[PDB]
Paper text:
Among these, the nonsense-mediated mRNA decay (NMD) pathway is responsible for the rapid detection and degradation of translated mRNAs harboring premature termination codons (PTCs), which can arise from mutations, transcription, or processing errors as well as alternative or defective splicing events. UPF1 is made of 2 structured domains: a CH-domain known to interact with UPF2 and an ATP-dependent RNA helicase domain (HD). Nmd4 is composed of a PIN domain (for PilT N-terminus) and interacts directly with the helicase domain of Upf1. Nmd4 stimulates Upf1-HD ATPase activity and strengthens Upf1-HD binding to RNA.
We also determined the 1.8 Å resolution crystal structure of the PIN domain of Nmd4 (residues 1 to 167) to help us solve the structure of the Nmd4/Upf1-HD complex. As this structure is virtually identical to the structure of the PIN domain of Nmd4 in the complex (rmsd of 0.5 Å over 163 Cα atoms between the 2 structures), we will only describe the structure of this domain in the Upf1-Nmd4 complex. The Nmd4 protein is composed of 2 domains. First, a PIN domain (residues 1 to 167), which is structurally similar to the PIN domains of Kluyveromyces lactis Nmd4 (KlNmd4; ) and of the human proteins SMG5 and SMG6. As previously observed for KlNmd4, the catalytic residue D1353 of the human SMG6 protein corresponds to a leucine (Leu112) in the S. cerevisiae Nmd4 protein. Since the D1353A mutation completely abolishes the enzymatic activity of SMG6, this strongly suggests that the PIN domain of Nmd4 is not endowed with endonucleolytic activity. This is in line with the lack of evidence for such activity in the yeast NMD pathway, in contrast to what has been shown in metazoans.
Numbering used by the authors: 1 to 164
Write the structure that this text describes.
Amino acid sequence: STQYNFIIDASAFEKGLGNIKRWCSDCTEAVTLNFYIPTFTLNELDFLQQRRKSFAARESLKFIDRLDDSKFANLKVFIEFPEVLDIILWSDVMEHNDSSGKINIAKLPKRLKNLLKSCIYKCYLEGNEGLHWFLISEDPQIREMAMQCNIPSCSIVDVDSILS
């Protein structure tokens, strides 16, 4: 039996909602899925739905509500408690940052710093639970900052190849 543990960003939902729904309905006793939805994702999908009139972002938020309300077979979903961001230390993110990396992590906008806090919390800190986590994203800036902080990431196509 295997379990995949994913942290899913907003761009993954906006660009790959149809793919994610298929993973959720095709998972079996042999392959179970375990999702963590950070505060970044909820806030960014709300921004996309309101400010960009994104149909896919609006549908993604409704799908996340369905996931959190209903108990799907072989699927676990956890929505981040926003107060966790005030407990996670920025110094714990900096301890995983490659200092030779070209991105100035300390100068990123607050919403991206908090996405990094959520990822580090799962990959390395109290949110780990003895599991191996991957970040799913369709945003190059996010994948590049995640790689500099040793957070493994995958595109929608990467996951589709691992699950097929």
